[PDB]
Amino acid sequence: DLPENKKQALKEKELGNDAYKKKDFDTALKHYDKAKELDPTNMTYITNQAAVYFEKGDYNKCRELCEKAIEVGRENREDYRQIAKAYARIGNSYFKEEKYKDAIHFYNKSLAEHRTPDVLKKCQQAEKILKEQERLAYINPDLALEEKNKGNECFQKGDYPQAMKHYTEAIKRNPKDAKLYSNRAACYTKLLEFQLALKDCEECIQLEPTFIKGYTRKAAALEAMKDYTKAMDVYQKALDLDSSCKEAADGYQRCMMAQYNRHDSPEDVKRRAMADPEVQQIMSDPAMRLILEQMQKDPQALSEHLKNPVIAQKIQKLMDVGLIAIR
């Protein structure tokens, strides 16, 4: 089946494999070195020796061996997957030394040889780690302050899009600046990007729960979008921090009436309420559909079912959005 020297290299390969199962790195190297000389046109002996050097932490030697194996496999037309494995291991030495940029370079070569699932996942980990390292390196609170300040100069002139651009650079430079998130939120509210005002206000608020302005900016966007029920709740959270606050009190009072005055046509109610996944779930759930039918037909079904919070709050949500009216 094999040339005698190939078979001899194989017997040594197998003995080397057993030596590695037992973590006998050095006996195994002896077996693979014999196997390598017996059958030199075969990457497997070289990559196995590299496996030792990788496990030992001797990454420079294992890299030289992987590179030699790659050159040999190409000369001798060995499977592309074998070449890929040697590259994957090279990327692994860099991964282990935390040189993720190099791990990626070599994993990219590995993928070209074969897009091995293991490489795809390991290189993704290398990217995630390197990307976080890069953001942390990017962060610099003083540059964030300079961009923030230019954003403020623009903002204050009514140039909200430019302010937003500078605020974006400032946040890349300082991610915990709660005030900065709310300044962007303001740009969006003024530009009618009310949805974006909400997302930046929410991060501002979680970072600084007492920043009453984060709440008034969010609530204003909600009120503007006729989401008076949440706008009132957000303005109220602002009132919980400071009951004398003007937007928190005034926006709250406008929402208090407007949330009912806007119902108008049921089409407005359906389009707005069904935008909310919570009521979509209530309506998509057949148990609720059955409960609702009983409720329409019998006010006592309501009297009894609403004593249990699992139903009472599904109903309360449908009432809050205006889908269920009670007379």
Partner: peptide, 7 residues
């Protein structure tokens, strides 16, 4: 209003 101010 708050949305015309910076912090």
């Amino acid at each position: 209003p708050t949305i015309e101010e910076v912090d």
